[PDB]
Design a protein around this nucleic acid. Structure first.
Lengths: 62, 45, 48, 48, 82
RNA sequence: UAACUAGGGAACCCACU
């Protein structure tokens, strides 16, 4: 049952939640992916602090 | 809050929660635009 | 054709970016937003 | 049995490859070591 | 602390070159005058790599020492990593 | 003589890794 048209999604500045101005959840509501805690740790490890600022502030909810 | 504590925000989590630029490498330093070397470059057409 | 990079118009790429804006959106290599000097967004998917 | 110019090249190479191996100021060493210890944690097993 | 007390490493680190290329190519893309004789590019990041290899990026890195002091290294003063 | 934005949550269950 796991087809790739059912699983593909991308997103760019689409619908935004009302409780906080972060993107939606899930591909059915055109939501974006979660940049979770472990990715925050991994980008600390890279030392990409401008990329980490771009993810966690600018391209999520400025 | 009950003790009136402060947070100097030199760490990493503080600047991420406040959304400003962390001091983590690419960010541990700061950059100054040079004054003399900008005289030496030509304007591109 | 759904994830965009915000490329700044400079005289090196102004003809290329001009052609991608003339293609508009969904003529795949083109663009969807064109952002003014004062931060004003103009759609390219709604055909101005 | 190196030669003299081979030995001068050798000392230059040792000095260069040591100066490249210095820890870079700004490196997030803490997260790097915590990941360096927690990534073999998933591969380890009490019952293997 | 003058050039006699200039105690950080002379080598430009990977983080310094990663942010210097970024903020130099961002300036080049905003129609800064280019310091080097480019052979024809549209990518500002390649032009900033040209300027980094030419050691002509007009940027001074302010290296903050952990006690509160700071050094000011020119990019042309720094030995490039690669 | 083209009127141009989107709206909820909480629980459980299942699946993927």
């Amino acid at each position: 049952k796991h087809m790739v048209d059912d699983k593909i999604h991308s997103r760019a500045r689409g619908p935004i939640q009302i409780l906080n101005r972060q993107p939606m959840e899930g591909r059915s509501r055109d939501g974006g992916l979660r940049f979770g805690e472990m990715e925050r740790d991994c980008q600390i490890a890279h030392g990409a602090a401008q990329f980490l600022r771009e993810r966690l502030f600018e391209a999520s909810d400025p | 809050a009950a003790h009136g504590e402060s947070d100097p925000m030199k760490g990493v989590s503080e600047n991420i929660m406040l959304g400003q630029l962390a001091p983590a490498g690419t960010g541990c330093f700061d950059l100054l635009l040079d004054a003399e070397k900008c005289k030496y470059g030509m304007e591109i057409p | 054709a759904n994830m965009t990079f915000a490329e700044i118009v400079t005289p090196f790429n102004i003809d290329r970016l001009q052609e991608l804006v003339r293609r508009g959106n969904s003529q795949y290599p083109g663009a969807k937003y064109i952002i003014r000097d004062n931060g004003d967004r103009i759609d390219l998917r709604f055909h101005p | 049995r190196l030669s003299g110019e081979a030995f001068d090249w050798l000392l230059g190479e040792i000095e260069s490859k040591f100066n490249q191996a210095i820890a870079h100021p700004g490196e997030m060493v803490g997260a790097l070591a915590a990941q360096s210890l927690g990534e073999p944690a998933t591969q380890m097993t009490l019952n293997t | 602390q003058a050039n006699q007390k200039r105690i950080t490493t002379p080598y430009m680190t990977k983080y310094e070159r990663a942010r210097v290329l970024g903020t130099r190519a961002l300036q080049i893309a905003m129609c800064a005058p280019v310091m080097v004789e480019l052979e024809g590019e549209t990518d500002p990041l390649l032009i900033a790599m040209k300027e980094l290899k030419a050691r002509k990026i007009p940027i001074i890195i302010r290296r903050y020492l952990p006690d509160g002091s700071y050094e000011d290294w020119g990019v042309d003063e720094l030995i490039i990593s690669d």
